Write a protein that binds this ligand. Structure first.
Ligand SMILES: Nc1ncnc2c1ncn2[C@@H]1O[C@H](COP(=O)(O)OP(=O)(O)OP(O)(O)=S)[C@@H](O)[C@H]1O
Ligand SMILES: Nc1ncnc2c1ncn2[C@@H]1O[C@H](COP(=O)(O)OP(=O)(O)OP(O)(O)=S)[C@@H](O)[C@H]1O
Ligand SMILES: Nc1ncnc2c1ncn2[C@@H]1O[C@H](COP(=O)(O)OP(=O)(O)O)[C@@H](O)[C@H]1O
Ligand SMILES: [Mg+2]
Ligand SMILES: [Mg+2]
Lengths: 728, 479
């Protein structure tokens, strides 16, 4: 249907007037990447913009910003027409003025702060119907053009004289503000937007089709995640972005109201928003109003949760609605709300990663001006547990640390301030380092699921067991073609066992990095404290959080501490078991081989373990991690100092010889002392940097075999037969 | 609806609940269906305050105080038989029970076809495979798996059509289909997350699926097949069938399979309760769900009830050296009170299995509980072919192999460790093929390399220990 029909999509780049396409559309287009284009759009309102080319788009799709996409009165997923035409020319007048409340409280000269610096060397097209936004000085400014050089197009040149009175504008009746949230105000969530985006999209954009079909569009959604994670943000974003009518319910709000006042208040919310459909209904803190465990005292609270049910279930299809609620943990809410015809969908919005945090940090760092020494790629690596709302108050508190010490000397106090200071005001790296050091980065910290940073090169030796792990994880994900042809079935779990400090934890994080699978780590002590006094109930959740993360490596680390809890050494009269070992391996038997979740245990004392976990179908492949030998003992040293400035004098072949029964962790203990003996001489020297050969000679003096000899023969005995361990 | 009438104001419900019978008294013959009887009649520690305790006693006086009225029948629904006031199950109240379980694959295919009727499908679809890939699924899961797969089709198909108007006509829909790539996609989302709990089914395993063991196969059909087949006999000669069996032997020698084989043979349902799962529901110092697995066994008869890896429980109390006391828990006792409960006129049939007969409680060996003891030995050469011959029956082995030759070099391998050889061989084959992308057929050299790393799973010095218990495990009670 011709290359006059294009679709809307949301840009990767942040720049104001551009559109990004691909070469197939270019081999359809045959026009430049520096050209101007005049686009046609809905409601007789159209606008002028330029194009470039790039791979991130598909064969056919169109990247835009909101500032473009709003004037065109279009939304993501609308048919647009680029109209590839070269009308190219300069314009003349281009008289602009600021917008109603967007300048409220800021005053003064706008030429050198705003406007001018935005146009320079990047002449930007303009039309009588372009509103645009300029970022700076802690503020988002909005503009409009009542007249310019006559239409359609005007293209600035590094001359053109712009003239502006200032003063507000009349607020446009229907024209949205750009300060309303949209898919660009959310970051780190990319994967769960597209999930929410598909699922809610077409029944909002295409109310008719469903009325034409017998398909039931899912209507109800539950968003998980700990507080401050952006649940309420993601909700309103979608409602704005999709065009829907967004009504909002607070839990406390309707539990604040008088008994019997809530019922009419909760009922009206649907009844009213029934009339305005298509409609979103968002319920903040569903936990407040529907808390069924031992639930509540007295009817009036037990009554309102049954009112909610008869609205969800007793929804007859009404006309058209979709309900969205939010809560901190999936639990604590009445189970009867998750049945079908009620909130059947679930979207778990976890904490962000560093790649997510940098995405967030840039969003709250946009509008403000920064010094050149800032990094923000390092910050994301120094903020560990942080949700989005922590990481926003880390930007706004760092920026108040800047404007206290800067303008206390200016000490100017009046009704409003103008932009020159703000423009010549910046935040430095010393502030971020300061606001990161307060207790504000105190933040919620719980089970994290991520792709690990460790690579294969980060571990030395072990080259064959590296080859065997990729057999057992890489391939069944890579080649589902095979394993049908030859039949059989992949084995699910693995068990590493060996001397302490020999590399088991690392080698589990390496394959996750290799297959880009998520990695969940559950350490024996942590697992056994949540059992607390005689109760846990959270184990089934780490298998859930593993299930919705697939492909996933699920790693049970230092699995020996649990068995020695029941008892170690001499031993009890009984075997080594707890009620938290049993509910693990009921749940292993639960997960299907069609799942690509993959389990790995590790133990430093194979002597003690429960045979139940070695049974075929639980942890079958047994892998014995030996101590390193000379040629590998170089690989270890060669590795962990890869970031250390070692001097040329050293012989790593020589270290590796004098050492024999050292663990890989104890080699790092030598390399550790050497480096800390170096810094003592340097610090002395303040009354030259490099690591020196003599240093390694002194460190090597105090080195310590971490594993005894007489216990090496014990690993060598279990290396042979650990299969025998079950049955007697 | 339960919530409906619990939504209404206090005292509004009474008149609302009463009218439902009073009205539908006038329109008889009449059904009265009560959704979620759990909402309105939850008596355990039951409730707070009268108004909720009042409405459950209003319901009772309607059920019991039904005088025969004219003509009515009441139907209610609930998730678990428990949680509802016991006083509602007395006679003149809901005395009937119909347990509607989860479906089987034969059931799921039946469902899938019902929500797949009206829609058009591509020819590559199967639906007999889907039913085998959807494991825990209830009907409502398996319906939203059809409607979400069919939305995956009409998003990518008509987004290019991008036609938006008041109504659409049928040509597209007719020329619109769903493919197998969609089902595979919607099956891969987390929507197939579904409730998964004790399943009762006829097992897929056959006799041919296990090699060797030809006499103990003959003895199991004596003990299960015949009293169901020939109730004529067992009267003529008198006596009585024995109820339970106990398999014991080295690990990996085929006990679990051989229990699922007879269930398949007599087309009896099969319930499996594994030692760990049984001992975690005891949770902290409480279970209350054991009597239910004997109920779910009772209403399923003819039923094989299989207690698998029954050793993990006894080693819980303690294994090896041992405690000062015997191996027991409060979850062993409430099993064998309940075994003594079920009558020989029931055709429910119990089977245990253990890898450590040394440790077990003698109480379960008493005549009238688990009487027939059967010792499952390790395979021998002629049987070790039958095992290999079996588990690769679906594998494309090349003609070069000698299965007679494998079986010789192996002696004390378990049947499960033979599969461990046959397992490695097949995974060493796929490595060469995957290399070869920069020919399919298992090769003789492959089995020669796999055989290199093979591992005796059972020690020699513990084989003489099974041979000693093989002789006398009856002696174990009394000292
Ligand atoms: N092959 C190796 N390559 C690099 N570092 C190693 C290696 N083996 C041990 N290490 C060091 O040991 C530390 C982590 O040890 P792990 O890989 O967890 O071994 P582990 O025995 O599973 O753990 P523990 O705590 O020593 S019992 C790392 O900081 C490494 O410096
Ligand atoms: N006679 C046999 N025929 C076929 N497969 C067998 C046989 N014996 C053992 N196996 C293999 O062992 C696996 C299941 O073993 P089971 O029959 O459960 O023996 P078990 O000793 O009761 O169970 P475990 O886990 O080995 S203690 C199957 O996957 C089979 O491949
Ligand atoms: N993914 C994200 N991207 C950008 N900002 C975020 C994100 N997540 C959280 N925030 C910040 O969190 C703050 C409030 O979050 P909120 O919507 O209240 O989350 P919740 O409702 O889950 O508590 C907002 O200021 C927003 O800046
Ligand atoms: Mg470790
Ligand atoms: Mg078994």
């Amino acid at each position: 249907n011709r290359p006059n029909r294009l679709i809307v999509d949301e840009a990767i780049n942040e720049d104001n007037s551009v559109v990004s396409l691909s070469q197939p559309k270019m081999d359809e287009l045959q026009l430049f990447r520096g050209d101007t284009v005049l686009l046609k759009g809905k409601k007789r309102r159209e606008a002028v913009c330029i194009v470039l080319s790039d791979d991130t788009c598909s064969d056919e799709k169109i990247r835009m910003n909101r500032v473009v996409r709003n004037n065109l009165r279009v939304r993501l997923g609308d048919v647009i027409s680029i109209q590839p035409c070269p009308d190219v020319k300069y314009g003349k007048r281009i008289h602009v003025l600021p917008i109603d409340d967007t300048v409220e409280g800021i005053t003064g000269n706008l030429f050198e702060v705003y406007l001018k610096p935005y146009f320079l060397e990047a002449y930007r097209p303009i039309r009588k119907g372009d509103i645009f936004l300029v970022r700076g000085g802690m503020r988002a400014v909005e503009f409009k053009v009542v007249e310019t050089d006559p239409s359609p197009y005007c293209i600035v040149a590094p001359d053109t004289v712009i003239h502006c009175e200032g003063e507000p504008i009349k607020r446009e009746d229907e024209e949205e503000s750009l300060n309303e949230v949209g898919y660009d105000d959310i970051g780190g969530c990319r994967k769960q937007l597209a999930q929410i985006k598909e699922m809610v999209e077409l029944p909002l954009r295409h109310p008719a089709l469903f009325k034409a079909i017998g398909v039931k569009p899912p209507r109800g959604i539950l968003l998980y995640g700990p507080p401050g994670t952006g649940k309420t943000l993601i909700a309103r974003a979608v409602a704005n972005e999709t065009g829907a009518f967004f009504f909002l319910i607070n839990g406390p709000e309707i539990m604040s109201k008088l008994a019997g006042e809530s019922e009419s208040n909760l009922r009206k919310a649907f009844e009213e928003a029934e009339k305005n459909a298509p409609a979103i209904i968002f319920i903040d803190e569903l936990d407040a109003i529907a808390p069924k465990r031992e639930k509540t005292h007295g009817e009036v609270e037990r009554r309102i949760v049954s009112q909610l049910l008869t609205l969800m279930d007793g929804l007859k299809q009404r006309a058209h609605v979709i309900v969205m609620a939010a809560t901190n943990r999936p639990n604590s809410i009445d189970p009867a709300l998750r049945r079908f015809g009620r909130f059947d969908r679930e979207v778990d919005i976890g904490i962000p990663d560093a790649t997510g945090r940098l995405e967030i940090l840039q969003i709250h760092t946009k509008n403000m001006k920064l010094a050149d020494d800032v990094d923000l790629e390092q910050v994301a690596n120094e903020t560990h547990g942080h949700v989005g709302a922590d990481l926003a108050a880390l930007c706004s508190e760092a920026a108040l640390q800047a404007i206290r010490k800067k303008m206390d000397l200016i000490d100017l106090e009046d009704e409003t301030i103008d932009a020159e200071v703000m423009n010549s005001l910046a935040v430095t790296m010393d502030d971020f380092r300061w606001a990161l050091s307060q207790s504000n980065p105190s933040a919620l910290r719980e089970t994290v699921v991520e792709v690990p940073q460790v690579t294969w090169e980060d571990i030395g030796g072990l080259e064959d067991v590296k080859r065997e792990l990729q057999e057992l994880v890489q391939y069944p994900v890579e080649h589902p073609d095979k394993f049908l042809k030859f039949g059989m079935t992949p084995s699910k779990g693995v068990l590493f066992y060996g001397p302490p400090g020999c590399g088991k934890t690392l080698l589990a994080k390496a394959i996750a990095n290799e297959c880009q699978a998520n990695f969940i780590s559950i350490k024996g002590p942590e697992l056994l404290t949540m059992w607390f006094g005689e109760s846990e109930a959270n184990v089934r959740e780490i298998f859930d959080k593993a299930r919705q993360a697939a492909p996933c490596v699920l790693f049970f680390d230092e699995l020996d501490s649990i068995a020695k809890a029941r008892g170690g050494n001499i031993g009890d009269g009984g075997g080594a078991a707890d009620r938290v070992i049993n509910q693990i391996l009921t749940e292993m038997d639960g997960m299907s081989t069609k799942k690509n979740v993959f389990i790995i245990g590790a133990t430093n004392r194979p002597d003690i373990i429960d045979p139940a976990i070695l049974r075929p179908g639980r942890l079958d492949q047994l892998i014995y991690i030996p101590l390193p030998d000379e040629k590998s003992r170089v690989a270890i040293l060669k590795a962990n100092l890869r970031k250390s400035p070692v001097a040329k004098d050293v012989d790593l072949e020589f270290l590796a010889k004098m050492t024999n029964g050292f663990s890989g962790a104890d080699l790092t203990e030598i390399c550790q002392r050497a480096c800390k003996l170096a810094i003592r001489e340097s610090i002395e020297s303040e009354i030259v940097p490099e690591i020196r050969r003599d240093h390694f000679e002194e460190a090597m003096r105090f080195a310590r075999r971490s594993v005894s000899d007489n216990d090496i023969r014990k690993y060598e005995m279990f290396a042979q037969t650990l299969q025998q361990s079950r049955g007697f």
